[PDB]
Amino acid sequence: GAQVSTQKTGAHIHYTNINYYKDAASNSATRQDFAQDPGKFTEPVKDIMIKSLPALN
Amino acid sequence: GAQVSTQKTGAHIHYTNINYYKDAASNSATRQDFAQDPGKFTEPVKDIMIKSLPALN
Amino acid sequence: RVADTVGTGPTNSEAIPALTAAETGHTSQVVPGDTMQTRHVKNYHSRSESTVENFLCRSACVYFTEYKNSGSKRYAEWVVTTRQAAQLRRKLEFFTYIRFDLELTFVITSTQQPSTTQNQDAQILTHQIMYVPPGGPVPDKVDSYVWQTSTNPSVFWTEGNAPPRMSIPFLSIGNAYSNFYDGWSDFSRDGVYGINTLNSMGTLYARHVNTGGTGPIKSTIRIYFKPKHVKAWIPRPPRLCQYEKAKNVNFQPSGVTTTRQSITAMTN
Amino acid sequence: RVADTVGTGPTNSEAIPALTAAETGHTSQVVPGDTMQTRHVKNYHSRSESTVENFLCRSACVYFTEYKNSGSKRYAEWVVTTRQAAQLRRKLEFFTYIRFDLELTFVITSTQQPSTTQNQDAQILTHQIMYVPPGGPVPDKVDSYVWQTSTNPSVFWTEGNAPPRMSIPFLSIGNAYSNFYDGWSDFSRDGVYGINTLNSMGTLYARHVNTGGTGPIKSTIRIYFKPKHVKAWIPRPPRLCQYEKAKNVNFQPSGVTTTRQSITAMTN
Amino acid sequence: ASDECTAGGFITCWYQTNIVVPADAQSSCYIMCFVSACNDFSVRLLKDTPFISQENFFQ
Amino acid sequence: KVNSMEAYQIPVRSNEGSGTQVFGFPLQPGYSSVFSRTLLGEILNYYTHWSGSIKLTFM
Amino acid sequence: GYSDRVRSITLGNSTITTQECANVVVGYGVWPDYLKDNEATAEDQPTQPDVATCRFYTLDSVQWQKTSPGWWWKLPDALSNLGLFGQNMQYHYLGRTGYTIHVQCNASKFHQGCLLVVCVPEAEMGCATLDNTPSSAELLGGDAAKEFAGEPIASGSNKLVQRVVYNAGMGIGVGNLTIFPHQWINLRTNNSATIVMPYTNSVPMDNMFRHNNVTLMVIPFVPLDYCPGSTTYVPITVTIAPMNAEYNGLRLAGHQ
Amino acid sequence: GYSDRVRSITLGNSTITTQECANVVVGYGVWPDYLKDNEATAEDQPTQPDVATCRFYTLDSVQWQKTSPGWWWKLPDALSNLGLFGQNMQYHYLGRTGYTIHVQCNASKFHQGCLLVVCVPEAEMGCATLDNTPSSAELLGGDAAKEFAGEPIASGSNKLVQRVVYNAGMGIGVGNLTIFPHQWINLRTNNSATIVMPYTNSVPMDNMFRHNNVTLMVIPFVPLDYCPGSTTYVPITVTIAPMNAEYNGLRLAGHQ
């Protein structure tokens, strides 16, 4: 059961990976996980604030 | 995802290549890129000149 | 992929993007275009090296110890702790809670030690590393039954080839590893206080399997840690201080920053 | 594939292929057939070794340095520069702008150094190479914290097997590497002038991980560079001069060519 | 790391107008400054940090 | 001032003439002493290259 | 119409009403909630005292002086002897709860001062002596505020928390406390600060007496200062309300 | 919601933000605009420096005293040596441009004063001596404010502008300056005044150095006055931004 994935390349090409162990802890790291969400740390406050309105009214 | 390409042979035969890395910078060199265009360096001038016409008229 | 700026044109308006309140604690989020006229620029830049996994997916040497083929100190024992190396400790400290698989590489180098004995002949040394879980009997001498390792994971290495490598599953009684614990070992609150209270990862023992030659040989074993499959939560500020012990966060007091000659001056 | 000549027959005509103007600067492009009668010949010749990638896809030794297991000079440091080797420098100079991935092979050879000490025993030496980005702390001594390499790429090699090999992604602040820069480091224009201004590729450090024997050992590390995925623009004439420094293009003045006895003579 | 080739810029503050206060209000006040990465901000070539160093392994 | 909480505070006062300069600091976050120890600066000390806009907030 | 500044919070039989407030902050964007069955390690049914435990509790006020380094409270210790909530934890081996924090300071328009109200998970204070861990009495104050010291603790060979303000006791820069959820009280713009905290911990439930989850800290970045004849005493009051409090492991009272 | 008083104007790389302002005034209800082809006398293409010329420029501030007759600026002269805009006019024979005027004064609630900010097309000042026209140095101040005099210029036989405040130098009543576009700054009600001017002139384009189109004048109808111990220095700052500036007649630099 071979898996085909994209490679890390520049902008302005696939690598085959096969698991040979069943421990699942013997796999490679998940380097390609480019997801971010600053909503927790920034804009923590309950009532939402618009970009251009008086902050306190 | 194996890729099959032609080999370098004489005139007057395929090699299999598989990428085992995702960095994409770990791939082999692109030796077989036989494209040339002297138009930049030779015949630089704007107005095109025919092979057998007086050069200046 | 990084967000790309939007082109803007001059306007006079009731709306006030630049004006905001610090007191709310909602960080202001204003683009360059709101403050000044800008031009449409596309960005191909990628936030692909800031990922927590990329930042923490590199081998670092947590600790090294020395043992002798002859003399009183036959074998070396090290308790398994992340804190004793500053670089590994500082990056782990960046998150309060971390969950991660561990990759271990051991590098062993043997140096001949000068001696009065002569015409020494040296057969290739073989080195045994054995890891004991809490409550496993400790070896008391190098020739002990504990060295059989029937119930204990163990690796044998012959000098002159690739360093031995193993993968470790996430081991914790807890759902996540705790970089900082604000707690006492007992209910009374009289006793040791600190992260050392949640510290029970076991101990590692290294010995010469065999002695090649009469002369004394000293072997150094270096242990390397590489986080894998990393998961983080509750981020913490940068430590900003030199470390003092691996059992506590006690610190000599430190100035906030290096000092420039004057508020106006651009020179550090 | 090379262009193949077309057969031609005698003719008298107004048209003048051989006649042309040098002043326009458009290189004349006339086949042999226009100047003389020719025969139809097919060419199987291929322009497949003139490609820039084939020309620059071969390992060359940019530089080598020596470090000692004992004595004051424990480790060797080399700043990473293409210019210090003439053959590598000359071919790179052929294009003003070049973009290319870098392949690095390190070959390490250790030679025993004669000494007064006797009955030496030598365990296999292990060698560590560590690359530091600009502003990474430099090691001041061989036993420094800098040698942990938690944030720094590093390779460990055991003597007696294939040389260590790594691939490097195209590293530049700029879109392309600049072989020549006509510029000053500062706005004033008083200061160092040259390509050295755009030179910030970091530094490489090599040390003995361990000492096998009491006697002195000297190790030479040789660094080899192989361009990959090459892309070139703005081609430059052949250098035509012996080099003098790696920081400037300063040259002793050179005659145009070797001299024959007379314009008529066919002997060099 | 500071580079001769690339100089980031100079940031400075000036009084557009004199500060004005009523009698019984303090003439002198204070201003705090907060610094952050924008949405377009990015980084590369991760390296060991200069500030953290150990003479010996800690105990 | 670094030893006290006065490091963060920037002094301002009513003055006879308008146009006096409140303060001046280097633009780069990583090398400058003023931004080296901040959240963004500390993360930057870890990485060799940096890109994009910086937001400065004054209360 | 309505005002963003005006607010009214009602928990149990206690209601809080401030004419002026900065927008309320939820620290990680998560409301406190009761534990899931899927995530629950303990088999025994939990006991939920509901409104009894979940009410505002007012602590002893402190005096803001022109030279006060700082004031800090260990929150679990703060409510350890207050009402049914103090009684339930003493009775039960395991407790998990959300916490509502409300810090109120009142001053005249002429007054000028800025206080930083930050709640920090797992803050570990470090002892002034390197070879000794900090004492429990120094670490936690029951019924009384514990105060930061502007100067570093002097050289000593005894248990003693290191209280220097810039390190904040954690040996970390005071300015970077922004990453922890926080709310700024500026006398010209804000009357009081409200922070709501989701329960945070690696384990789903933990014994409250042995372990403290979060620590409320107040530090003045800008000193209080006023012209002569103005009120010279300023009072800061901390009110804390438990949220969705639940208890397990019914046991005989007291800790040892 | 929004406030009528709050405003934010962004021109080029300069942004102006005032918490309190009187409604902005367009003097004849006409926005400044580039010249029409139908109306254009000159055949040669014009050069439009765009954002370079069109940015706010800040002038030297003045001190409002309890007895200041008045301050007045010739606007074309004011920006004659400032940035690219000063350079373009020196290079070019003909220039036509719109002008944005922003006058900012800050005072404590206790302070009381009223300033009249009026822009007047073709103001011609009259010399104190009847037989002599006014001198250029007296008529226009470059990089510096020119000040009205409460008393009439004394008897003289020399060039000298007549500066008496009631005549305003035009020999016309000060009160009737209302017909010219204007905005009142009252310390209790207004922080600053914004006036936007359409280009005004008989000819479509005119040489800037020889001829000045409009003159900004500030006069206090009500004197500044305050109780003792209040800030005794008040600063008035004039910021001017060119609008839709265009240039023609590329010529060697300087005027003669």
Ligand SMILES: CCCCCCCCCCCCCCCC(=O)O
């Ligand atoms: C068989 C030889 C190797 C034995 C390895 C034993 C398992 C070691 C696991 C260490 C994990 C450290 C996690 C971070 C620090 C901590 O939470 O204690």
Ligand SMILES: CCCCCCCCCCCCCCCC(=O)O
């Ligand atoms: C981990 C050990 C290897 C470290 C390699 C570091 C990267 C070296 C890159 C050198 C590129 C040279 C490019 C041509 C010359 C120049 O433009 O400066």
